[PDB]
Motif scaffolding. Structure first.
Motif, short mmCIF file in Angstrom:
data_model
loop_
_atom_site.label_atom_id
_atom_site.label_comp_id
_atom_site.label_asym_id
_atom_site.label_seq_id
_atom_site.Cartn_x
_atom_site.Cartn_y
_atom_site.Cartn_z
N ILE E 121 0.82 -1.26 -0.02
CA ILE E 121 0.17 -0.01 0.06
C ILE E 121 0.85 1.20 0.01
O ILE E 121 0.36 2.46 -0.40
N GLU E 122 2.03 1.24 0.40
CA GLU E 122 2.77 2.38 0.49
C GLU E 122 3.50 2.64 -0.60
O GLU E 122 3.57 3.88 -1.17
N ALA E 123 3.52 1.78 -1.67
CA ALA E 123 3.76 2.36 -3.09
C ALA E 123 2.52 2.94 -3.78
O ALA E 123 2.82 3.94 -4.54
N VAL E 124 1.43 2.51 -3.31
CA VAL E 124 0.29 3.16 -3.99
C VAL E 124 0.13 4.65 -3.40
O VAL E 124 -0.19 5.77 -3.90
N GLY E 125 0.60 4.81 -1.79
CA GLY E 125 0.68 6.18 -1.15
C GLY E 125 1.64 6.95 -1.95
O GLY E 125 1.41 8.15 -2.32
N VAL E 155 -3.48 10.02 0.38
CA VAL E 155 -2.35 9.69 0.86
C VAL E 155 -2.26 9.22 2.17
O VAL E 155 -1.66 8.22 2.60
N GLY E 156 -2.81 10.17 3.01
CA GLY E 156 -3.14 9.75 4.41
C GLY E 156 -4.08 8.57 4.69
O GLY E 156 -3.81 7.69 5.63
N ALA E 157 -4.88 8.28 3.61
CA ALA E 157 -5.88 7.00 3.76
C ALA E 157 -5.09 5.93 3.33
O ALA E 157 -5.47 4.80 4.02
N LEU E 158 -4.42 5.91 2.31
CA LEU E 158 -3.73 4.35 1.94
C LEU E 158 -2.53 4.33 2.92
O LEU E 158 -2.42 2.83 3.03
N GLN E 159 -2.06 4.98 3.56
CA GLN E 159 -1.18 4.49 4.77
C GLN E 159 -1.90 4.08 5.78
O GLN E 159 -2.04 4.69 6.99
#
Ligand SMILES: CCC1=C(C)/C(=C/C2=NC(=C\c3[nH]c(/C=C4\NC(=O)[C@H](C)[C@H]4CC)c(C)c3CCC(=O)O)/C(CCC(=O)O)=C2C)NC1=O
Ligand SMILES: CCC1=C(C)/C(=C/C2=NC(=C\c3[nH]c(/C=C4\NC(=O)[C@H](C)[C@H]4CC)c(C)c3CCC(=O)O)/C(CCC(=O)O)=C2C)NC1=O
Ligand SMILES: CCC1=C(C)/C(=C/C2=NC(=C\c3[nH]c(/C=C4\NC(=O)[C@H](C)[C@H]4CC)c(C)c3CCC(=O)O)/C(CCC(=O)O)=C2C)NC1=O
Ligand SMILES: CCC1=C(C)/C(=C/C2=NC(=C\c3[nH]c(/C=C4\NC(=O)[C@H](C)[C@H]4CC)c(C)c3CCC(=O)O)/C(CCC(=O)O)=C2C)NC1=O
Ligand SMILES: CCC1=C(C)/C(=C/C2=NC(=C\c3[nH]c(/C=C4\NC(=O)[C@H](C)[C@H]4CC)c(C)c3CCC(=O)O)/C(CCC(=O)O)=C2C)NC1=O
Ligand SMILES: CCC1=C(C)/C(=C/C2=NC(=C\c3[nH]c(/C=C4\NC(=O)[C@H](C)[C@H]4CC)c(C)c3CCC(=O)O)/C(CCC(=O)O)=C2C)NC1=O
Ligand SMILES: CCC1=C(C)/C(=C/C2=NC(=C\c3[nH]c(/C=C4\NC(=O)[C@H](C)[C@H]4CC)c(C)c3CCC(=O)O)/C(CCC(=O)O)=C2C)NC1=O
Ligand SMILES: CCC1=C(C)/C(=C/C2=NC(=C\c3[nH]c(/C=C4\NC(=O)[C@H](C)[C@H]4CC)c(C)c3CCC(=O)O)/C(CCC(=O)O)=C2C)NC1=O
Lengths: 159, 160, 241, 65, 159, 160, 160, 160, 159, 160
Positions: E121-125, E155-159
């Motif tokens: 998920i960090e790569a999506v962020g 960006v805060g949601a995907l993390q």
């Protein structure tokens, strides 16, 4: 394992000593567990080649790199086909109970073949280690031990 | 209920003692419990891998995950993974009990009502349970995969 | 890459208006919970909580339904704060008002569902949970029934002491979604008939003849008896019919 | 017959990110036959019971509560 | 933002308090700037997905690496399609003025979806951060602030 | 739902970006929101006067408030005032949202079931909602009274 | 309460109209609201970085995170991060309101009771709030860091 | 908590691995668990007979069951039987756990507060728990009666 | 496992049902094997932390890389101390027979702790996987199965 | 019913004469009837080709025509062709009437009952009607394909 004891007692002029008959009777008893382990590794082959390619190309990226041998789709398909071959020989060695019909087809001249193909042998050993890890995750404890037996033989052989 | 509890109940409602046919049933259950426990252990090993492989076999790259499909929204994808994990877990419970009554009591009770209320496609669910059954029959072997596929096909047949 | 996620169909008006509601109802992420987190010196934020409690536990309201309005001591103990919200819901359920709204026109079977819809926020799960509440309505009053209803470790692990109940959309138990939607889609005083009377026990379509290595074991072991059984002397094992 | 209890709840299972201050510590009145299961529920969470006090009731009286 | 105030005053038995009417009137006033920002992000989508894939695959090369998920043309096309989806939801949140119709379609169950897809998920962020940087270069200052608002929420949601 | 949320949903289920027709719809909503807010304020001013004038226009001095009618008992008169206040309040919500979906979701869902269960006369309710519509169209003006009468006639048409 | 609401209340309980001193107070609040809003925005930017830097300044590598300390268990470390995030968030609310009454109403009400019930060390909490105050006064500047440190020192003084 | 869990906790808060003294403690617990389970079974057999014999030994035919005493009213007699059943049941739990922490956590927490609030006589309760201890030490044998009497005397000592 | 059955029968008003007494008697029987497994993992701790750091830093080099958290001797010492902590909790769970006294100290709030420390949780999961592999090499088959049980619980918990 | 008959009915149940809005509706119908008739003619041209192309797009070479699927038996394949010809023919009737009431009266009345009785998969039927809609919208043009797809999507939405 019967050919092993037969040529072993055949070099001598003696018959098969009954301790060898005991080991043949015990292998005959364990053959059902051997057949179940071989069928479990049989039906789940493409998962094992997928996870082996996963763990190998995560471990060694030089085969992915264009200076390495397994560069491009054709070469990486040949690479996973080699891993498929070694999984097949491991199932043969699991059924036969002793490493002769797998060493006769995959071990006995592999170093000069991979040397005159350009590929490194240590990456193949890491691929069989990845196959052993994936089959250890696939099987139970007493099954993964007995599979990691012959996988361990292949890993020691390729080095 | 169990297979043991079903045998005891069938002997009880007649007032019958445990005759030899019931003892045959219980001894067959006590013979099969070995592979039952081993199958339940290795299914509890990698349930997430089974659900991932099943959606990659059946549901992914279809129109169902495209917009307009029922798995387009990400909460609906998470609900799909939850439902497939439920089917696999309750099929594991019914396999270890040796009696499909817990599927009838806990899963298949009001499920067609819910899936026709929400507009959930039933045939795609049946094909997903079929892909679950193929993946776990490959993973566990044929001999326990038969008993796993019996209860997964029970869920599939009651769903339809 | 602008092709893997574009639809190739049209989706005109009924298909445009059905895929809008292609899942769970919109009321899930809109039923706002009411939490007593204001404080003691507030006389305004608790007014909304009190009216919210009357909206949850009674279906409609209490304004055109009681003459000399009670709960004024209850509202006072709420505003002062020597009483949690859970004991206020207790006082609402104890009152003879609620006894006259839901216990008196409705039977003992239907009051279990109308009493778990209000307090726990959802229909009863299986038949044994109807049996225990029916015994509590059998040899004890409703003043003990809703008492044992709210003092369970399902009320105080989900709602907590300072929240009012809110309409839950339960997932995990068997048929706990569609019974709750059947309860909550109905308006107040709409159908006198009982929504879920009981749970009909359904029989299985496989008893033990399948499960085919329990069934293979029946056979293999039935034939295990008559194969020579070599453990004891051989002479006793040729003379067995 | 009501009791005035001051009690604390641990909330060990999850890391609540809301206010959640009232629940950890409270001073509430509870009726007679209700304090029984309240006692039991507070002990289920390992909660400390600080002080139990009589609010309503004379002890030792038999009729009339 | 009107549904937010409506269900907010709807949980209460009170009407819509006129401070909420003031915030609705102010959102109604700012809607024209919202529509211009959404159209500017609309017509320039493929540039934003190109520069986001640029900055992401420069930042994290493991999706490019064969052990990662986005290996090959099909998987990298699915990756840029995911970034296209998130840009589309960001434009929806820019028009709606509040993050409800974007969280309802892209946030609320994303962690278990990406966990059972294998992707991190960090790569999506980081991809949505690259989208925010490219849209910050594309827009003016008061427009990039108001776009980086909802991009920041994603960006805060995907993390 | 909103008009904004309906436009976003109709653009979403196709996977379509916001094209110019949707931007036209949103800009028309952002144009009309001025009188929407002003109308909602002055309807929230004197809702009780509107309900009083509506029952004085339509329901009072009939046989309905006489004995035998459905509004004879004083709790039934209070329930009548409650239902008319509900119709006016939810019509205000649907006017400010610009989308009648909240009327379909919160009012018109199981309402004919209730009104045929209780024996509530439907035609007198329709005439009372009509008198509500005339009173608030007089009170708010014609230009917002049109949009108020659209949702009040929506309630009246779904009720029948 | 606000500073506006406190001024209105102090003028109300006397029955006094808004005299010139109250108008001075409100105009001073309307002057300071600029940096109040800018400070609240940049504190809402990186609250997690502030809490991380504060525990790295004060609480980490002590005996408190060693076994025997109150932050040894990982749920207790998570509860520590939660409490520090609470202190920073409510100090942000009290900074933007310009009145510390919400700290007295929502944080400092029964907090010493809780911290003496659980055995939470109070002095380490005070030093952690001090490190929070130093980090955010460095991050926001001196001019808004004064007003942030006023409410953080209010929490620290009421805690002791 | 257990004796196992107490040993694990005492090894954990030091960061210590399981040394030989902790293994001695766990192996002593695994030796004593046989008679622990057998004692718990036969105490669960006839708990009502134990409570009946205890009140017949200590509390009956006194002034306590006479009018003026605390056990005169029949609801107070039922509450007395309930409290004695609680003491016996939680002593059974503490005997099978091998650690008196559940008595401290679930019984002895706020019990003197309650018994001084209600006016319950404490010395008669202590003598009733003593009679419980004598009856169950006679019923179970001396070897498990020692461990039962340890936790019953723990309840009696904490009550006083 | 005794506290589990005790609070399990304690939420109910019933006694401990004798099937629970059977499971307690069976755990009491297996406690000697549990103690031997725990002592074997006890005395060989530094080997396990060494091989876990080996396999982890071979697997994920970003903790070694200066952008990662475990950069430098102090941070890598804290990293191996974390692995030592998790091995200690695994021995506690091996003795206790059920995962409550290990989840109570290492699992129940670990995600927010490692999030507000900056470290990724997947690298910690790979470290516990390396601990499981090294302990599987250290023990026999029936011992490695029963150790990989609780190691498997930790690996599933950290993800 | 027609669009003409629906307009006449809506004017009749009020007792209303034909006002200008109804005349607008009838004149819009009399404008669109040209392409309505031309579309109905060219759909009546090659209905068999449309059904053949639709099953070749959606249903063929799947598991549905394989054994185990619902279209395996040749009488079931003929019944599938019959049902798709029914959907296309009644959609042609609803397109030429300009009112979907004949779909509600003659097709969608008891159809989900039948398809859940026989075990007919509903989602494959919906995808087949979708392929029908795409083929006839390609064949007739976009301008009449919109009105054809409206009634085919009406059948698809009522079926689900
Ligand atoms: C069953 C006994 C058996 C073995 C062992 C075997 C090996 C084998 N490997 C080959 C090629 C290859 N083998 C590899 C191997 C690898 N990729 C890597 O990077 C690693 C070093 C390794 C596997 C992970 C590659 C890359 C090629 C293609 C090399 C080339 O095209 O020159 C080829 C020539 C192409 C072919 O005909 O398949 C043979 C014969 N064949 C056999 O029948
Ligand atoms: C233990 C037995 C059991 C089941 C199965 C169960 C299912 C169930 N699935 C639901 C939703 C759902 N179920 C699905 C599942 C599917 N849709 C598809 O397209 C696929 C064919 C299929 C997945 C394989 C989806 C996508 C939703 C989301 C609808 C929504 O919430 O908007 C809901 C609505 C509320 C919620 O998920 O939390 C329930 C109750 N409950 C139970 O107690
Ligand atoms: C049945 C016995 C009983 C009493 C008396 C009772 C009183 C009571 N009076 C209160 C407030 C109050 N009580 C008073 C009363 C007075 N102040 C004055 O100046 C006058 C001298 C006096 C009126 C004669 C006022 C003015 C308040 C308002 C304080 C506030 O809410 O801000 C409150 C705070 C919350 C609330 O009213 O709803 C309680 C609980 N509760 C009870 O259960
Ligand atoms: C609008 C709401 C929405 C979301 C969020 C969504 C996600 C989504 N991502 C997918 C695949 C994927 N997603 C990615 C993601 C990435 N590449 C990477 O390396 C990064 C981690 C990340 C993007 C930069 C990859 C690589 C795949 C293919 C994985 C596979 O084939 O297993 C799939 C399955 C294939 C498909 O049907 O498209 C879905 C449903 N779909 C949706 O409808
Ligand atoms: C928000 C949408 C909504 C509505 C409308 C609603 C209506 C509703 N109206 C009711 C009764 C009633 N409704 C009416 C209304 C009328 N009878 C007449 O003669 C007039 C034509 C009409 C008034 C204009 C009356 C007189 C009763 C009383 C029946 C009774 O309680 O005995 C009841 C029965 C219980 C109760 O009032 O508290 C409901 C639930 N509930 C809702 O949730
Ligand atoms: C909004 C105002 C507010 C605060 C502050 C608050 C605090 C609070 N802190 C708690 C625990 C805790 N609080 C701390 C905090 C600390 N211990 C230390 O060593 C440090 C000095 C300090 C951190 C800086 C710890 C370690 C616990 C864990 C005790 C436990 O749960 O076992 C608990 C017990 C239950 C729970 O966390 O979920 C509450 C209620 N509640 C509130 O409503
Ligand atoms: C699990 C630990 C535990 C205990 C012990 C407990 C006790 C307890 N005993 C009570 C009353 C009582 N307790 C007693 C007991 C006694 N009085 C005597 O004279 C004897 C010396 C003694 C009996 C041996 C009596 C007589 C009452 C009745 C007082 C009343 O209700 O009027 C009450 C008041 C409410 C109620 O019974 O339902 C509690 C809470 N609660 C607990 O949670
Ligand atoms: C027994 C329960 C328990 C846990 C779980 C625990 C974790 C823990 N890990 C810490 C640091 C750390 N933890 C790691 C972790 C790692 N290195 C990596 O790259 C990987 C992601 C991972 C291990 C392989 C690192 C690098 C630090 C130092 C981070 C810093 O200094 O900011 C710290 C702060 C320093 C300290 O006081 O030790 C705690 C409290 N402490 C506990 O008492």
């Amino acid at each position: 394992i019967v050919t092993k004891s037969i040529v072993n007692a055949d070099a001598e002029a003696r018959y098969l000593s009954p301790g060898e008959l005991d080991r043949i009777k015990s292998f005959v008893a364990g053959g059902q567990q051997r057949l179940r382990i071989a069928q479990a590794l049989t039906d789940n082959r493409e998962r094992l080649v997928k996870q082996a390619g996963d763990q190998l190309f995560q471990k060694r990226p030089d085969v992915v790199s264009p200076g390495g041998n397994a560069y491009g789709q054709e070469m990486t398909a040949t690479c996973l086909r080699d891993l498929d071959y070694y999984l097949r020989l491991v199932t043969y060695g699991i059924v036969a109970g002793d490493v002769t019909p797998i060493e006769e087809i995959g071990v006995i001249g592999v170093r000069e073949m991979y040397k005159s193909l350009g590929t490194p042998i240590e990456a193949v050993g890491e691929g069989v280690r990845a196959l052993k890890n994936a089959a250890s995750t696939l099987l139970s404890a007493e099954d993964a031990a007995e599979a990691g037996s012959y996988f361990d033989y292949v890993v020691g052989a390729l080095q | 209920q169990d297979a043991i509890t079903a045998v005891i109940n069938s002997a009880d409602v007649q007032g019958k003692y445990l005759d030899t046919a019931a003892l045959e049933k219980l001894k067959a259950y006590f013979s099969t419990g070995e592979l039952r426990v081993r199958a339940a252990t290795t299914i509890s090993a990698n349930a997430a891998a089974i659900v991932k492989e099943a959606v990659a076999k059946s549901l992914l790259y279809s129109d169902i995950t495209r917009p307009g499909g029922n798995m387009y929204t990400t909460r609906r994808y998470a609900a799909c993974i939850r439902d497939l994990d439920y089917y696999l877990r309750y099929a594991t419970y019914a396999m270890l009990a040796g009696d499909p009554s817990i599927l009838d009591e806990r899963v298949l009770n009001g499920l067609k009502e819910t899936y026709n209320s929400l507009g959930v496609p039933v045939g795609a669910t049946v094909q997903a349970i079929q892909a679950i059954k193929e993946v776990t029959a490959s993973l566990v072997g044929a001999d326990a995969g038969k008993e796993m596929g019996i209860y997964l096909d029970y869920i599939s047949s009651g769903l339809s | 890459f602008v092709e893997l996620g574009t639809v190739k169909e049209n989706r005109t008006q009924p298909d445009i208006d059905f895929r809008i509601n292609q899942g769970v109802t919109k009321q899930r992420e809109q039923t706002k919970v009411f939490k007593r987190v204001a404080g003691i010196k507030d006389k305004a934020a608790i007014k909304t909580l009190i009216s919210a409690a009357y909206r949850q536990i009674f279906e409609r309201d209490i304004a055109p339904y009681i003459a000399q309005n009670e709960f004024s001591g209850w509202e006072s103990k709420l505003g002062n704060g020597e009483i949690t919200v859970k004991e206020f819901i207790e006082g609402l359920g104890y009152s003879n008002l609620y006894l006259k709204e839901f216990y008196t026109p409705y039977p003992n079977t239907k009051v279990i569902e109308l009493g778990t819809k209000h307090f726990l926020g959802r229909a009863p799960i299986d038949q044994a949970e109807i049996r225990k509440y029916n015994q509590i309505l059998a040899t004890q009053g409703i003043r003990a029934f809703i008492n044992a209803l709210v003092n369970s470790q399902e009320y105080n692990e989900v709602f907590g002491e300072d929240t009012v109940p809110y309409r839950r959309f339960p997932t995990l138990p068997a048929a706990n979604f569609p019974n709750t939607q059947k309860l909550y889609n109905q308006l107040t005083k709409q159908n006198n008939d009982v929504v879920i009377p009981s749970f009909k026990p359904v029989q299985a379509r496989i008893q033990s003849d399948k499960t085919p290595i329990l069934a293979k074991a029946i056979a293999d072991l039935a034939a295990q008896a008559k194969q020579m059984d070599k453990s004891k002397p051989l002479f006793i094992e040729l003379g067995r019919s | 017959r009501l009791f005035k209890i001051t009690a604390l709840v641990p909330s060990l299972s999850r890391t609540r990110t809301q206010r959640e201050l009232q629940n950890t510590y409270f001073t509430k009145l509870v009726p007679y036959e209700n304090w029984f299961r309240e006692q039991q529920r507070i002990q289920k969470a390992g909660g400390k019971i600080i002080k139990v006090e009589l609010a309503t009731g004379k002890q030792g009286t038999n009729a009339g509560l």
